[PDB]
Design a protein around this motif. Structure first.
Motif: not given
Ligand SMILES: NC(=O)N[C@@H](CC(=O)O)C(=O)O
Ligand SMILES: O=C1C[C@@H](C(=O)O)NC(=O)N1
Ligand SMILES: [Zn+2]
Ligand SMILES: [Zn+2]
Ligand SMILES: [Zn+2]
Ligand SMILES: [Zn+2]
Lengths: 344, 343
Positions: B184, B191, B193, B241-242
């Motif tokens: 990730v 993308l 998570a 992007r978590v």
């Protein structure tokens, strides 16, 4: 006509019988089938004296149903405070057949276990001297060691140094669960043996965790990945003669298995022998099944092989869903399943 | 004494179940979170706009008055799903995303996707319309060890898929490994998570040492400490992007504590304070708000919430159980003292 498998009466080289009412319920499942069993000492409080071992033996003999020819072989729980003269007297008097070493823990009370192998050298040296076998639950239990690594870590950190120091001491690596241990034992000398349970042959950790969590497959040492399972099956299938039957039948009431914090142990005494028979058959190694159940253990311990026989029949039977205790129930190994081999 | 004020959070991965269970569990979410991604693994699964609309109403019916909570509905992908059904749902503001469950991998997944190839027209249409794909990333082959199923998925399913649909937006849900964390971390802007509180707080030893703990049994299975440490490092780094996805996944106590216990942690009651503890422990509280309240909305193309909540660093006792009509429910950290509580 269903296939018959006749063997010299087997023995169980690793057994938990508990005490009190639980002992009364579970003993018959052993005494009906096995001539002798190594009875482990992890009671509360543990069996650490000759007098307690004698009393426990009698409680066990009281609970054997009439006509079963069963002899319990008693053990001493190794602790820091254990006097080596108490251990020796017990061995000399035929009370202790062996002594059991549970994993070391620096915080353990000295009446209840071992802080380190160093701390119990006087006692281990006395066992070496008199030729008393040491049974080892070989895991290191430090909080920073992943549970699946604990057996392999023990080989390297404890078992090899111990054996390098005490070269005449007879050691059983109990209920081995890994390729690490199977290789170690395979490559050892005549003073090193092992027991293997039916669950570590039949299953791996996927069976405990895929499709749900199955606390009746929860036991120590923990079920490992399939490569380890296969190494255990290959070892028993090879005819290697220093592995033998030890069930580690380890009963807990259902309420203590199926809770927020399930106890470790499989109640496999009722179904162990047939399970071993199934495993040997699947491995095309039934010619070695008798030796495993009835000969290898006695040879290692310097005891006679049983001279009566029992028969297993390849006829499907259903395993009971549960076994009643005074309060609560026990759920046996393979509860509710159709098994392939049973005692006649 | 210490008070931490954050933008009101959202939950980008939630199970609300249905019926009585739904009525019991919704308030633990609706009182705190502005929105939630409501997963579609009911029995039978939510695979049509009509079912999603009715389900959404059952959820809203159970939201107490005063709570400003919006359920973001999802479609349960199946091999035979009509891409038009999914697209109509997206166009009508019903489906926010679609969820890929590999057949038999998890809770209520028997009806799940058997391969990517079987659903390509559906994924191509998601790619075309800009609908995010939420992925339960595990393989299921009986031969593969459970602890390896997440890593094996990356290699065999996720990477090929993303190479094939280079514009498809993917959330690698509830990641549990260093493999997934690095994957990730090194991915592109398409993308993301989610990570649960339990995969940050514990490793497999906490579920298996000293006893077997079914209330920590959940999927993907708790991994080695090295994996747990990688997940903590990822959220602590400020990587954006978590984001927060509890995977709150309630089952009645008797279903958890049986001879074959169901997978899932009921963590809604304690998740937010648990994240706060992890962030505090990692010396990364400056990144906490973004994880809870900004990163998810950015990835989904939705506005951030315009209200604020406070967490206080006062030690509180988690309930031992929560009553259902004909059952009980054991919360994540039941009976524990928890360090942070919502003011
Ligand atoms: N994760 C779980 O352990 N349980 C979830 C399903 C899921 O997220 O896979 C559930 O719905 O029960
Ligand atoms: O080490 C052990 C102890 C045993 C018991 O319950 O006595 N149970 C196990 O699962 N292994
Ligand atoms: Zn043991
Ligand atoms: Zn034992
Ligand atoms: Zn999932
Ligand atoms: Zn989920």
């Amino acid at each position: 006509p269903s296939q018959v498998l006749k063997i010299r009466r087997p023995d169980d080289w690793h057994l938990h019988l508990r005490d009190g009412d639980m002992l009364k319920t579970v003993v018959p499942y052993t005494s009906e089938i096995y001539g002798r069993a190594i009875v482990m000492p992890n009671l509360a409080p543990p069996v650490t004296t000759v007098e307690a071992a004698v009393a426990y033996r009698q409680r066990i003999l009281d609970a054997v149903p009439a006509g079963h020819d069963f002899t319990p072989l008693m053990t001493c729980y190794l602790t820091d405070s254990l006097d080596p003269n108490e251990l020796e007297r017990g061995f000399n008097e035929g009370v202790f057949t062996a002594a059991k070493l549970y994993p070391a823990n620096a915080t353990t009370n000295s009446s209840h276990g071992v802080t380190s192998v160093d701390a119990i050298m006087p006692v281990l040296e006395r066992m070496e001297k008199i030729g008393m076998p040491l049974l080892v639950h070989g895991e290191v239990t430090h909080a920073d060691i992943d549970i699946f690594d604990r057996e392999a870590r023990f080989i390297e950190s404890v078992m090899e140094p111990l054996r390098q120091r005490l070269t005449a001491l007879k050691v059983v690596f109990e209920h081995i669960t890994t390729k690490d241990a199977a290789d170690y034992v395979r490559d050892g000398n005549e003073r090193l043996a092992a027991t293997i349970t039916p669950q570590h042959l039949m299953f791996n950790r996927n069976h405990m965790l895929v499709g749900g969590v199955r606390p009746h497959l929860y036991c120590l040492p923990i079920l490992k990945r399939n490569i380890h399972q296969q190494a255990l099956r290959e070892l028993v299938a090879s005819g290697f003669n220093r592995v033998f039957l030890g069930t580690d039948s380890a009963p807990h009431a259902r309420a203590r298995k199926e809770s927020s914090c399930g106890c470790a142990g499989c109640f496999n005494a009722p179904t162990a022998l047939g399970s071993y028979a199934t495993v040997f058959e699947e491995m095309n190694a039934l010619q070695h099944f008798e030796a495993f159940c009835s000969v290898n253990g006695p040879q290692f311990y310097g005891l006679p092989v049983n001279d009566t026989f029992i028969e297993l029949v390849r006829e499907e039977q259903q395993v009971a869903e549960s076994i009643a205790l005074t309060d609560d129930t026990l759920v046996p190994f393979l509860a509710g399943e159709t098994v392939r081999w049973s005692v006649k």
